[PDB]
Amino acid sequence: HVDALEVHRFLKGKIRTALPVEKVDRETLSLLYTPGVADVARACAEDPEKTYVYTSRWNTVAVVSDGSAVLGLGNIGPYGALPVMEGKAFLFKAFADIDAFPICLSESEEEKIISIVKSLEPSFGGINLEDIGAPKCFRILQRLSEEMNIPVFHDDQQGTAVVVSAAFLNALKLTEKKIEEVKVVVNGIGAAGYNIVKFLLDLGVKNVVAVDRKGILNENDPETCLNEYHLEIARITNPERLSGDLETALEGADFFIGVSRGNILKPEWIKKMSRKPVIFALANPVPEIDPELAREAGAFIVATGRSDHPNQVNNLLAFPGIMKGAVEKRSKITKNMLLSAVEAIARSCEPEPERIIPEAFDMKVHLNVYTAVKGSA
Amino acid sequence: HVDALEVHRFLKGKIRTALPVEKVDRETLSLLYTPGVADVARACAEDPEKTYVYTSRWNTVAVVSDGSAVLGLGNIGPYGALPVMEGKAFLFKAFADIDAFPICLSESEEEKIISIVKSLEPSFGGINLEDIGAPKCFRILQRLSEEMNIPVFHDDQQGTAVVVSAAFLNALKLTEKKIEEVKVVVNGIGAAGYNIVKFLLDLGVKNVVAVDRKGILNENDPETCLNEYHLEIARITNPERLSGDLETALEGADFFIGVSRGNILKPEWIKKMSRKPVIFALANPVPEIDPELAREAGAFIVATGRSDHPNQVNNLLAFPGIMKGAVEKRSKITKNMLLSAVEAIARSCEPEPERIIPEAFDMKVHLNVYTAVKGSA
Amino acid sequence: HVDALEVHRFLKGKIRTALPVEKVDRETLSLLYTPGVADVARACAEDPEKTYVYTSRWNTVAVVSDGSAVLGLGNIGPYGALPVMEGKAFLFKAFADIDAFPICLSESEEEKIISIVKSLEPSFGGINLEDIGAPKCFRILQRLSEEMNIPVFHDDQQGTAVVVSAAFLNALKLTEKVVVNGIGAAGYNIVKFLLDLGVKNVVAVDRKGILNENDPETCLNEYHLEIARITNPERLSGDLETALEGADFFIGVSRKPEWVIFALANPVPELAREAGAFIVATGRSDHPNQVNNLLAFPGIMKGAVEKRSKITKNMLLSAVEAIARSCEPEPERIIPEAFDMKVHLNVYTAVKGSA
Amino acid sequence: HVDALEVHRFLKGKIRTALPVEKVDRETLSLLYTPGVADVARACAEDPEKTYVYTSRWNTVAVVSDGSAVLGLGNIGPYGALPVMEGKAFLFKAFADIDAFPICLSESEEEKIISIVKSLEPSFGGINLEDIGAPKCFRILQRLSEEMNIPVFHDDQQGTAVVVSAAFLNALKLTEKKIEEVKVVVNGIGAAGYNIVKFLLDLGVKNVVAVDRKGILNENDPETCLNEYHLEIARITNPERLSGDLETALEGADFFIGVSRGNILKPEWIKKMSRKPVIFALANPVPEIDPELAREAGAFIVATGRSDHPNQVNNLLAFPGIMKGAVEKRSKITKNMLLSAVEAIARSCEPEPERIIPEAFDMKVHLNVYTAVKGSA
């Protein structure tokens, strides 16, 4: 009977601050505050880059949310978001030694978020956008990364894409199929899906069939398009010009990657997919199909977003290293950096069907991602 | 002999974060992050007050500046401000065990600042405005404290006024004069001066005479009104309707409180003030008159802003206790609470001419301030 | 309603260490380890006092126990004592900012304990003996405090006596002007404080009755003999009931109603309310009027370590007075609670000032 | 001009403690102290292994010295040792997250040290003996590791031997010679030398030649045997039954390993060693021969104990992982565990002449050593 609530109540928060020194005397204050701190102020005004030498800015990250898409719970707001962003901050400290600080905003208009986060630049070495709904989060990420001079990263977009891509590459190796030749069905084209399709295409997949809640995205019957972003996905997708529902998409498919809803992939559809079919059922918290059921129906490899099962595709393998690398580099996160991360995660294990990527507590992963990202232009 | 710069470089910042637990395993994450943290999110969304029980909000404070008036250096900006705000955060932790975090903004238009800070409400239990220039900081303070539901406190305004008030009360006790009957000259109607005038009035002084760089403030010599705030001060000031320069003001005055520029009060003017005259010459870093010189010219009590001399009037006596009390009470900071603090500081020692207030390393002071503020809320 | 065990399990201890710096690079190591640290070594070897300037010694305290008298549980040993010493260390940091560290020893012969603790002198600025049984703890305290040159303090003797004395003085004030039961570590020292304070009729009682040199059965060691010699005015004698009959005060380190009550045994002695009777003090962090060491040790240790001298009668009585003056006594609150920070500041100030 | 002394003074120590929780109230005490702690006390008395579950014992280590052999300084005592043991503790935390405490003893008779440290067993998960002179440290290590049920490790003996061994294996590989055929001269048979000899023999070296102040160790020249431990070494070394000084020993030698004094190996001797000679000159702080001088005289590979030069053979690569592994395993440190560490360090890089082992800041090493040690007998 050890409750998450009980333990939060007892800890009164997961976020501590802490002093460099124990004793605080006249001399200490004259150094760390007035009058000595004036010199450090003069220095940082004359040259902002010197904040990276004389303050904590070289290692501080803002975890920014308006709570418009918290976990699986939806748009619950900044107050609901706060304990979740404290948890992320805790993870940042524990897995990367990054001093992360939750910034939960009571503003949800795009343009306003964007100008608020821009204003924080002097205070942080990096920005981690988290649990901000789609499609606004597409514009918010693009704008802030383009206009800020510290790295800006959105887990549910770039993190998921990185880890899905590394899993995909290893499953594909096990499958023994050519990347240019496989048919990959991606279902659920919100933040993750949009970015997954883009990774898959950069990597070499040529036949990506995208699907969302009114079917396969197709210019020619464009009832298939909630958003402009789905427009963009059909322009670069579905080479065979297929049309119909998920079930139709899966005919002959080699991979299904779902970042969508629970229990929607029926088991008999697996038998209409190609031989040695791979199923990434990452809907949170209930996967698109139950993993055992999928195994029983013939799946070669099954992955989910849960720690309950083997082959957990989890953002945690990505964000510590990426953020650490990017913040040290001090520049914009680039495609090359994200693909270095993909490759690092992938090579961080010898793939087997029951283990196509490492687990997050394997500290070598975080090291290798860090290194990969630090080293890339 | 150690440099402020060298030690900052070595420390790479004065701000740490730190974790509740050492070991981080599957179980710990299931409690402090997913899935357990979803319960906590649901509870805080349902009732935002619960952030005070389940997160660090009960003890976190944002130290907010745009760097428009840093220490004695002026409008150097948010980067120069950062190491200073780090210093302030250090002090909050050391003297009140408050987890303070610097928020240095690259926005300096007053309406934009206001709206940025408002949006941060969910992430903090209190706001400490710091080193924001006058006159914009008057409106900023007023608006944020009226519109936010966590306390907002600006040191240079409210802290200085609190300490100056407590100093004034004790000095007045030692002088043996009636508050209704004394003439008090306040010179320099900026951040501090403005607020010092208002406190003195709230306290019961009747003859306050305000002075700035174009002379005594009087509604009928409109030259003397450099903004709307000076006009406001002129309208609640100067009962005898006096007109002229600082020298004229001081004729018969009992107190001079200067928060202005260096070596401005000529020693011979002291002899034209009333008997047992009191001189708070708080201009930083050079006082309005040299303290020994003022003693020599007949000053009964002399106080400055420096540690160099007896009677250091410094904000540090005020902000720890006030902020701790206010965040705990969760309410807006009120005239009551500020006056509690004044009285608690004043009663924190037995006044004599060379010691009219306590030193800031006397930890009884911070406890008494804290207790006073907690109790009037 | 979270369990003490479950939370100890989740915390995996109440003791952390922590680094001054975050980033650790070639430069940092060259300053804090080799080769820079050799200069600091040379300096401390040439002058041991410099450990107070260059190391954490100025603020570290060893919390020493063999587990021979743990809380109310008895001689459970060093392993049972460990989570308790961890608690005491936690309190030391919380209430005095002292970096305390548990030293639970698997040795219980007194001369060996004494020489082990002596050998630790270079590593600490102070020693807090804790939960070591009587009567060996009387010799252990005296020897270590006489032979070491850092302060050594034993809670259950000096801390309990301080707090009991402050409680007593305030209770006496409310009374508008004394039986001590259980003459172990605490009782012994409680008796002597009450005498130093001015009480004339102290009556000491232990498991064989009221201590009277003329009834030799009542003298379980030399120390009870000593107490019998400076206690009991109407040279009276018998068990407790006779001991307590029409009684100024009852003070117990212990385990009928009819005859001010500090009953301070772990769990209880002897209605602790609704059986009448004016003032009622527990040991518990549970009920009104808790007489606990916590009010004393933080401040006393902080003061003593800073003054660097041996703890004296004067310093302990400072503490007694500072705790007693730390509130306005009313029957339901004859002393402050431990989380009133003012108390620890006042104790610290008092002890510093009498050093 | 930034001094080690100045910085130590400013930090007033490198050791902090820190609390799990920030606020302390009635409820907290009732859980972490009386009366709740009594249940934890009962549990640990009933079963001492439960200290690993309910206290910090699972992760605390005593750093034990009497200061009989501090750094390169000698027998300076426990006060001189203290700032050094604080440094070691700081390393333990930084590289392994181990909570290490300095225990510097004012007792230096060996039996007395032994009984003191045994008495501390309930308070620690592990013992790190440090800077205790030879030959008493031989008996001290052996007795404590035999008699205690927490691991006991002495750096200068076991750590130095582990790192020297890995360096040796990699150097040997680069050399392309067979381990059973090389002549290896070890000079300075103190805490390190004794153990280095024994590891090399375990590893497969057959011609090890031990040398100390009175010459090559040889039972037949009894002068050469300064204690029983040198006699022991003489009996398992020097198969060719050589006799004479270091210079004689080096004729035809393939490796020199010195853990002795500065500037004793003359450059021209290198030319009488075999082809592609390897020189580990680890005397601290001045090497047995200047490294450049050695290169200039024909050395194929040169290593020292300093960070000043390539190929730093330093204990830091070994102790964090070893201690962490051992303390978690809870059992006695074994020969298999130490050889796993040797292998793990060696494989943690691709050896080249200018880099035969990794540097300590390569965090992969510490992970690999930890894994190796945790996994072995």
Residue A358 to residues A366, B283, C316, D368, D374, Cα–Cα distance (Å)? 10, 62, 60, 16, 19
Interface membership of C329 toward D (CB under 8 Å): no
At D309, which amino acid appears? H
Cα–Cα distance measured from residue D302 to residue D281, given in angstroms and rounded to the nearest whole number: 7
| Count of residues in chain C | 355
Edge to edge, the sheet with strand A99-104 lists: A99-104, A60-65, A126-129, A152-154
Torsion over CA: B271, B277, B282, B285 (sign): positive
Record the tokens describing residue C265, joined without a space.
């045994």
Residues from chain B that touch A87, judged by Cβ atoms under 8 A, are: 32-34, 37
- Subunits close to C (at least 3 CB pairs below 8 A): A, B, D
The answer to whether the annotation marks D165 as part of a ligand binding site is no
Nearest CA-CA partner of A95 in A310, A341, A330, A318: A318
Cα–Cα distance measured from residue D318 to residue D321, given in angstroms and rounded to the nearest whole number: 6
The answer to whether the annotation marks C156 as part of a ligand binding site is yes
A12 phi and psi angles, rounded to 5 deg:
45, 55
- H/E run at residue B45: helix B37-46
Q: Which of D7, D22, D23 sits opposite B10 (nearest CB)?
A: D7
Interface membership of C9 toward B (CB under 8 Å): no
Cα–Cα distance measured from residue C296 to residue C132, given in angstroms and rounded to the nearest whole number: 18
Query: What angle, 0 to 180 degrees and rounded to 10, lies between the N-to-C axes of helices C313-324 and C341-353?
Result: 150
Q: Hey, how many other C-beta atoms are within 10 angstroms of the C-beta on B46?
A: 12
Angle of CA points B33, B36, B38, to nearest 5°: 85
User: Nearest 10 degrees: CA dihedral of A120, A123, A128, A129?
Assistant: -10
**Residue D178 buriedness (CB in 10 A; 0-12 / 13-18 / 19+):** exposed
Three-class SS of residue C127?
strand
Q: Is the peptide bond before A35 cis (omega within 30 degrees of 0)?
A: yes
Interface membership of A4 toward D (CB under 8 Å): no
C341/B367 Cβ within 8 A: yes
Nearest CA-CA partner of C57 in C149, C154, C155: C149
Q: For this experimental structure, what is the resolution in angstroms?
A: 2.6
Q: Which of B16, B23, B367 sits opposite C12 (nearest CB)?
A: B23
- H/E run at residue A226: none
Q: Residue C5: beta bridge partners?
A: none
Q: Which of C13, C22, C341 sits opposite B12 (nearest CB)?
A: C22
Alpha helices by DSSP H, chain A? 4-11, 26-32, 36-46, 51-54, 78-96, 110-119, 136-147, 160-175, 191-203, 228-235, 246-250, 267-270, 291-296, 319-329, 335-347, 363-375
At C74, which amino acid appears? G
Query: In sequence order, what are the residues at sequence separation of 6 or more whose Cβ sits closer than 8 angstroms to the Cβ of residue B107?
Result: A115, A119, B66, B113, B116
Query: In sequence order, what are the residues at sequence separation of 6 or more whose Cβ sits closer than 8 angstroms to the Cβ of residue A278?
Result: A171, A172, A175, A254, A255, A256, A299, A300, A301, A302, A303
Closest chain A residue to C20 measured between Cα atoms? Answer: A20
* CA count, 13 A, side-chain hemisphere, A325: 27
A22/D16 Cβ within 8 A: yes
Residues from chain D that touch A363, judged by Cβ atoms under 8 A, are: 367
D197 phi and psi angles, rounded to 5 deg:
-55, -50
C108 phi and psi angles, rounded to 5 deg:
-125, -5
Three-class SS of residue B47?
coil
Q: Residue A64: beta bridge partners?
A: A103, A129
Interface membership of D13 toward A (CB under 8 Å): yes
Three-class SS of residue B349?
coil
At A89, which amino acid appears? A
Record the tokens describing residue B66, joined without a space.
């745009």
Record the tokens describing residue B306, joined without a space.
């420096």
Cα–Cα distance measured from residue B221 to residue B345, given in angstroms and rounded to the nearest whole number: 38
Residues from chain B that touch A20, judged by Cβ atoms under 8 A, are: 11, 14, 16
Interface membership of C1 toward D (CB under 8 Å): no
Closest chain C residue to D88 measured between Cα atoms? Answer: C33
**Residue C23 buriedness (CB in 10 A; 0-12 / 13-18 / 19+):** middle
Cα–Cα distance measured from residue B337 to residue B349, given in angstroms and rounded to the nearest whole number: 20
Cα–Cα distance measured from residue C277 to residue B349, given in angstroms and rounded to the nearest whole number: 41
Residue with tokens 């404070």: B61
Cα–Cα distance measured from residue D145 to residue D142, given in angstroms and rounded to the nearest whole number: 5
Query: In sequence order, what are the residues at sequence separation of 6 or more whose Cβ sits closer than 8 angstroms to the Cβ of residue A263?
Result: A286, A287, A288, A289, A290
Edge to edge, the sheet with strand C99-104 lists: C99-104, C60-65, C126-129, C152-154
| Count of residues in chain A | 377
B158 sits in the region (left: phi over 0; alpha: psi -120 to 50; else beta) called: alpha
DSSP C233-284: SS---SSHHHHHSS-S-EEES-------EEE-SSS----TTTS--S-EEBS-
- Cα A252 from chain centroid (whole Å): 29
The answer to whether the annotation marks C186 as part of a ligand binding site is yes
Q: Is the peptide bond before B320 cis (omega within 30 degrees of 0)?
A: no
Q: Is the peptide bond before D35 cis (omega within 30 degrees of 0)?
A: yes
Q: Residue D255: beta bridge partners?
A: D184, D278
Three-class SS of residue C68?
coil
Whole-number CA gyration radius for chain D = 22
**Domains observed in chain B:** 1-154 (3.40.50.10380), 155-377 (3.40.50.720)
- Scored b (16 or more CB within 10 A) or e, B191-222 reads bbbbbbbbbbeeeebebbbbbbeebbbbeeee
Cα–Cα distance measured from residue C113 to residue D116, given in angstroms and rounded to the nearest whole number: 9
Whole-number CA gyration radius for chain B = 22
- H/E run at residue B338: helix B335-346
Cα–Cα distance measured from residue D207 to residue D200, given in angstroms and rounded to the nearest whole number: 10
- Is residue A219 within 8 A of residue A237, CB to CB? The reply is no
- Is residue B102 within 8 A of residue A122, CB to CB? The reply is no
| Bridge pairing between strands D183-187 and D152-154 | unpaired
Torsion over CA: D323, D329, D330, D333 (sign): negative
Residue with tokens 């509690």: B340
Nearest CA-CA partner of A96 in A377, A305, A328: A328
Q: Residue A183: beta bridge partners?
A: A207
Nearest CA-CA partner of B43 in A335, A70, A244: A70
Cα–Cα distance measured from residue A229 to residue A189, given in angstroms and rounded to the nearest whole number: 9
Record the tokens describing residue A110, joined without a space.
């795009």
Q: Hey, how many other C-beta atoms are within 10 angstroms of the C-beta on A174?
A: 16
Whole-number CA gyration radius for chain A = 22
Q: State the nearest Cα–Cα gap between D347 and chain B, in angstroms.
A: 28
Interface membership of C295 toward D (CB under 8 Å): no
Query: In sequence order, what are the residues at sequence separation of 6 or more whose Cβ sits closer than 8 angstroms to the Cβ of residue B213?
Result: B226
Mutate to test the interface with D, among B9, B22, B97 (most CBs of D within 10 A): B22
Interface membership of C13 toward D (CB under 8 Å): yes
Q: Is the peptide bond before D102 cis (omega within 30 degrees of 0)?
A: no
Query: In sequence order, what are the residues at sequence separation of 6 or more whose Cβ sits closer than 8 angstroms to the Cβ of residue B278?
Result: B168, B171, B172, B175, B254, B255, B256, B299, B300, B301, B302, B303
- Scored b (16 or more CB within 10 A) or e, D188-215 reads bbbbbbbbbbbbbeeeebebbbbbbeeb
What are the start-end ranges of the E strands in D259-335? Answer: 278-281, 301-304
- Is residue C342 within 8 A of residue C299, CB to CB? The reply is no
The answer to whether the annotation marks B187 as part of a ligand binding site is yes
Q: How far apart are the first and last CA of chain B?
A: 46
At B155, which amino acid appears? D
Residue C336 to residues C166, C202, C296, D23, Cα–Cα distance (Å)? 10, 25, 11, 18
Would you give the DSSP letter of residue B205?
-
Residues from chain D that touch A16, judged by Cβ atoms under 8 A, are: 22
**Residue B96 buriedness (CB in 10 A; 0-12 / 13-18 / 19+):** buried
- Is residue A320 within 8 A of residue A89, CB to CB? The reply is no
Alpha helices by DSSP H, chain D? 4-11, 26-32, 37-46, 51-54, 78-96, 110-119, 136-147, 160-175, 191-203, 228-235, 246-250, 267-270, 291-296, 319-329, 335-346, 363-375
Nearest CA-CA partner of B100 in A127, A58, A128, A123: A123
Cα–Cα distance measured from residue A323 to residue A232, given in angstroms and rounded to the nearest whole number: 28
